[PDB]
Amino acid sequence: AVTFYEDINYGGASVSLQPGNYTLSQLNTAKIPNDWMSSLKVPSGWTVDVYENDNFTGTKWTYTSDTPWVGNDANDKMTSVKIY
């Protein structure tokens, strides 16, 4: 599973998700708010595509390993996400 974090360097509230394609509604149901994610852990061999807008549209930021900082553009922008 992938773990998403509120704050940089794996800080604040955290929620883990198995692979899948999660819309904003599905994220909210798992207690992940909109425009909230700052860091994440990604198991080796997995890809996380973070989308700026809902339904897997808008800018996409790709992570293939643990990161304490998603970057200036990606920070607090996650609205949908694909994990595969």
The site for a copy of itself (CB under 8 A) is made up of 17-23, 26, 51-53, 56-62, 73, 83-84
- Closest to 5 (Cα-Cα) out of 43, 34, 41: 41
Among positions 34-73, residues that touch Ca ion (CB under 5 A) are 35, 38, 52
Segment lying near Ca ion (by CB under 5 A), choices 13-21, 28-36, 39-47, 60-68 = 28-36
Closest separation between CB of residue 81 and a copy of itself, Å?
11
- Compute the least distance from the CB of residue 18 to a copy of itself, in Å: 5
**Cβ proximity of 10 and 16 under 8 Å:** no
**Reading across the β-sheet that carries 80-83, which strands appear in turn?**
20-22, 80-83, 48-53
Residue 81: which of 67, 37, 12 has the closest Cα? 37
Please choose which of a copy of itself, Ca ion, none residue 61 contacts, taking the beta carbon within 5 to 8 angstroms, the exact cut-off set by kind: a copy of itself
Count of residues of this chain found to bind Ca ion when the rule CB under 5 A is applied: 7
Contact 83, 2 (CB under 8 A): yes
